Amino acid sequence: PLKVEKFATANRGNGLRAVTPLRPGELLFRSDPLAYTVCKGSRGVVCDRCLLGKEKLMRCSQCRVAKYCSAKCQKKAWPDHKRECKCLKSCKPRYPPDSVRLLGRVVFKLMDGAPSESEKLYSFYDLESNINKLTEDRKEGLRQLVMTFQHFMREEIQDASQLPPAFDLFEAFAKVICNSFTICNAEMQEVGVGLYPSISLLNHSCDPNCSIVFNGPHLLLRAVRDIEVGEELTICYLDMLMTSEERRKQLRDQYCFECDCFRCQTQDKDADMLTGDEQVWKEVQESLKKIEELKAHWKWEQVLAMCQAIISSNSERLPDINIYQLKVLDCAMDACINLGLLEEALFYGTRTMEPYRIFFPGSHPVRGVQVMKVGKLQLHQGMFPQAMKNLRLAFDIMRVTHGREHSLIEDLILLLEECDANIRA
Ligand SMILES: C[S@@+](CC[C@H](N)C(=O)[O-])C[C@H]1O[C@@H](n2cnc3c(N)ncnc32)[C@H](O)[C@@H]1O
Ligand SMILES: [Zn+2]
Ligand SMILES: [Zn+2]
Ligand SMILES: [Zn+2]
């Protein structure tokens, strides 16, 4: 039986609440997507189906756009790819926005597929559109996405008879804007976008009591605090390394609400996040636009070079608790790990540990994963007591955020055993 239920909230639409008392780490729901796609940066880098990276991917011969890890993935993907394949082929060399490829897959799934377990608690039909809150600038954007979909899909979808009953493309894209999930790989790299309509019942908090984690396209929802019967379940929609001003902007622009948690009234953590010289951090925040774009496209050498120019600047430097500096350290660590510069990775990674302790309170999967990365780098280098410390800590966090149902926890258990054996010997 379910441990969660849909309910009507007082002022934030529908939500999800606990039916039984919940403890940290408890699995509350699990879902495959209604629909998902690889994201722009990762296309041709990770398998379309399993979202795992490979050195060499095999392309779909018909469209040459979909790429796969294996014959098993290409074949398994074919039913959900076959209609988009003709559209992707037709519009070559144009490639659509991710939202447009996503909605195409939504439409084909709803037209051709059996009712989806992803819609058990709540359906695409039910999703919030916020249409009475959209600004004229947003409505113009949505109009353009509708016309882009009509162009991209024209080989497969010519009229309304090929859309679900009463389906309105403008409304559908408004639902995609505020109900898209970013799918992250095991290393917390963004690799895809998906719709998970049951999980879309969860409302936002800047200090949430649940968390989601991805294992390929599969989503696990877990409690990360004690929760009482009847208590609303929340997740944080946003990256933790954001000031209240930045959260306000994104919650308005993407989700059309004003968040009234304690952290937002009190600007909790903002001052410590913005320590250091403001001219310098403004420059680094600007440089991060490019660094994050490069990272999104897995360009690790260009990422490292830009990060080193900041971390080791001749000019004024920032404290590592400054969130822009911190994001630069984290990109530099990940670029080093991917490039096999393991000593340099560990330097950057260890610098992030105290700031991550501060900015990811409680049990947050991003901190779990960071601590595991650092442990693994220390294990490699023969630093056993320190690795063991960090691997235990990663486990204390990831037992709650990831759980036994997540494959990374098995990987971590193997590092723990290896490290323990080394210490014992
Ligand atoms: C993923 S949906 C969450 C479920 C939604 N309340 C519903 O009725 O379908 C996100 C939308 O929920 C509302 N929302 C989520 N968190 C909220 C919050 N903390 N305060 C006010 N509205 C919130 C906003 O309308 C937002 O665009
Ligand atoms: Zn695959
Ligand atoms: Zn194809
Ligand atoms: Zn808030």
Curated annotation (Swiss-Prot):
Annotated localization: Cytoplasm; Nucleus
Tissue: Expressed in skeletal muscles and testis. Overexpressed in a majority of colorectal and hepatocellular carcinomas.
InterPro entries (UniProt xref): H3K4_H4K5_MeTrfase, Hist-Lys_N-MeTrfase_SMYD3, SET_dom, SET_dom_sf, SMYD3_SET, TPR-like_helical_dom_sf, Znf_MYND
Keywords noted in UniProt: Acetylation, Chromatin regulator, Cytoplasm, Metal-binding, Methyltransferase, Nucleus, Phosphoprotein, S-adenosyl-L-methionine, Transferase, Zinc, Zinc-finger
GO biological process: cellular response to dexamethasone stimulus; establishment of protein localization; methylation; myotube cell development; nucleosome assembly; positive regulation of transcription by RNA polymerase II
Reaction catalysed by this enzyme: L-lysyl(4)-[histone H3] + 3 S-adenosyl-L-methionine = N(6),N(6),N(6)-trimethyl-L-lysyl(4)-[histone H3] + 3 S-adenosyl-L-homocysteine + 3 H(+)
Top-level lineage group: Eukaryota
Cross-referenced PROSITE patterns: SAM_MT43_2, SET, ZF_MYND_1, ZF_MYND_2
Activity regulation annotation text: Histone methyltransferase activity strongly stimulated by HSPCA.
Annotated residues for binding of Zn(2+) 1: C47, C50, C69, C73
Residues holding S-adenosyl-L-methionine: R12, G13, N14, Y122, N130, N179, N203, H204, Y237, F257
Residue spans, zinc finger MYND-type: 47-85
GO molecular function, one term: zinc ion binding
EC number: 2.1.1.354
Region (C-terminal domain) residue spans: 270-425
Limits of the SET domain: 2-238
Modified residues (Phosphothreonine): T20
Residue numbers binding Zn(2+) 2: C60, C63, H81, C85
Broadest EC class assigned to this enzyme: transferase
Any Pfam family the entry gives: zf-MYND
Subunit structure: Interacts with HSPCA. Interacts with HELZ. Interacts with POLR2A; the interaction may be indirect and may be mediated by HELZ. Interacts with HSP90AA1; this interaction enhances SMYD3 histone-lysine N-methyltransferase.
Family classification: Belongs to the class V-like SAM-binding methyltransferase superfamily. Histone-lysine methyltransferase family.
The protein's role, per its UniProt record: Histone methyltransferase. Specifically methylates 'Lys-4' of histone H3, inducing di- and tri-methylation, but not monomethylation. Also methylates 'Lys-5' of histone H4. Plays an important role in transcriptional activation as a member of an RNA polymerase complex. Binds DNA containing 5'-CCCTCC-3' or 5'-GAGGGG-3' sequences.
Name of this protein: Histone-lysine N-methyltransferase SMYD3
Organism: Homo sapiens (Human)
